[PDB]
């Protein structure tokens, strides 16, 4: 149970915040878990997904399909994965939106800032796991 008097357990307030979150907050919302091997390799459990990441679908009708994250449609709260497409009537191909919480990251697109972020998360995880 929550203890913070400034944190609201109101369903309406939570839903309003989620569906009116700005882009930088939707980034954090759209986070995906790492696979077991990646988790042991990098020390972290989950990270805010990013374009050019490799993922595997863990649930749904596309379970087991892999590919690269083509886009992060933060407005629609979905990601478009490579090779995960369907065909419209006319014949064009449209990417099927997947919620990042239903996929697992198999390779992290690392840059300067992503490396620093992973370092921070791993340091914090080690610090807390030591005390626990």
């Amino acid at each position: 149970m929550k203890v913070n008097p400034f944190v609201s357990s109101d369903s309406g307030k939570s839903r309003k915040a989620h569906f009116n979150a700005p882009s930088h907050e939707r980034r954090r919302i759209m986070s995906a878990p790492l696979t077991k091997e990646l988790r042991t390799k990098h020390g972290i459990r989950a990270i805010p997904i990013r374009t050019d990441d490799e993922v595997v679908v863990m649930r749904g009708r596309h379970k087991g399909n892999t590919g690269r994250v083509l886009r992060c449609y933060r407005k629609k709260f979905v990601i478009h994965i490579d090779k995960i497409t369907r065909e419209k009537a006319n014949g064009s191909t449209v990417h099927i939106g997947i919620h990042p919480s239903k996929v697992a990251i198999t390779k992290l697109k690392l840059d300067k800032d992503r490396r620093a972020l992973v370092e921070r998360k791993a340091a914090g995880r080690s610090r807390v796991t030591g005390i626990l």
């Binding site: 149970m1 357990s9 109101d10 369903s11």
Partner: protein, 289 residues
């Protein structure tokens, strides 16, 4: 809770009177919109004030006599010590060692939910929490929309006397409550107003009960001024032993059956044996004839 005091009265509405072939309800004024000429104000009208708008100064809270609160808490405690009442209230106590269930003060040193869960499992109290888990369900009705999404069973209550911050080990277990023996809450001792909550007493809490609630001697309670355990109105509370006692049996008279009545009236003027049973001389008279 209350409705807005101006709800349904924010219209400059006037009755049209008679002669217009319409009911004399006040009607919205103006023109050029659907609202114009529609009924207003009355509780029968769409968009008017409800009947007797609910006011904010209703009697919400109540004054409860301290003596009766203490009586209720004592009764709830006493009922917690009856195995049958706990079963009737739904707690699973099949393999519980003893009612009341007093445990060592070591439980007051618990600091991790792992330790608390192990203790509950080994005490054969986990059946109650398993039933609590199975009882979680969606609340039926509008409560779901008002931050009361789920309903679930209540588990045991752990009562402690000296807290080494033991309640932390128990908070997260569903249904399990934790209380301090000095401040015992009737709302947790008798949920829903029903008797027979399952209680786990620590040794210190059990030892402090006499100090807190006194005995049957007047003013025996030290922490509640002038309080003492209420006296019963019946000494022997079982109705069968009194009835079957030798003293009562001696005074009682032998049981009887429902009195028997003829029920059916026959016609001795038409039958033989009936008439001859009622008047044996009729047979002699007929013989003479």
């Amino acid at each position: 809770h209350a409705v807005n005091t101006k709800a349904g009265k924010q219209h400059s509405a006037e009755s049209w009177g008679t002669g217009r072939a319409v009911a004399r309800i006040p009607r919205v004024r103006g023109g050029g919109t659907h609202r114009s000429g529609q009924g207003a104000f009355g509780n029968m009208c769409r968009g008017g004030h409800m009947f007797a708008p609910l006011k904010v100064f209703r009697r919400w809270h109540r004054n409860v006599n301290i003596a009766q609160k203490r009586y209720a808490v004592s009764s709830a405690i006493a009922a917690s010590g009856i195995p049958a009442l706990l079963q009737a209230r739904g707690h699973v106590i099949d393999q519980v060692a003893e009612v009341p269930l007093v445990v060592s003060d070591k439980v007051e040193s618990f600091r991790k939910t792992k330790e608390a869960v192990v203790f509950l499992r080994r005490s054969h109290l986990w059946a109650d929490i398993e039933k609590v888990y199975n009882s979680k369900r969606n609340r039926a009705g509008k409560g779901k929309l008002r931050n009361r999404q789920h309903k679930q069973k209540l588990g045991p209550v752990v009562i402690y006397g000296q807290d080494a911050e033991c309640a932390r080990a128990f908070r997260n277990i569903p249904g399990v409550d934790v209380m301090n023996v000095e401040r015992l809450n009737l709302l947790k001792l008798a949920p829903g107003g029903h008797l027979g909550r399952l209680i786990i007493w620590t040794e210190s809490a059990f030892k402090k009960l006499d100090t807190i609630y006194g005995t049957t001697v007047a003013n025996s309670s030290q922490l509640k001024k002038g309080w003492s355990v209420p006296l019963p109105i019946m000494a022997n509370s079982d109705f069968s032993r009194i009835i079957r006692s030798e003293e009562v049996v001696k005074a009682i008279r032998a049981p009887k059956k429902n009195p028997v009545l003829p029920k059916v009236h026959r016609n001795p003027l038409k039958k033989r044996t009936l008439l001859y049973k009622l008047n044996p001389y009729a047979s002699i008279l007929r013989k003479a004839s």
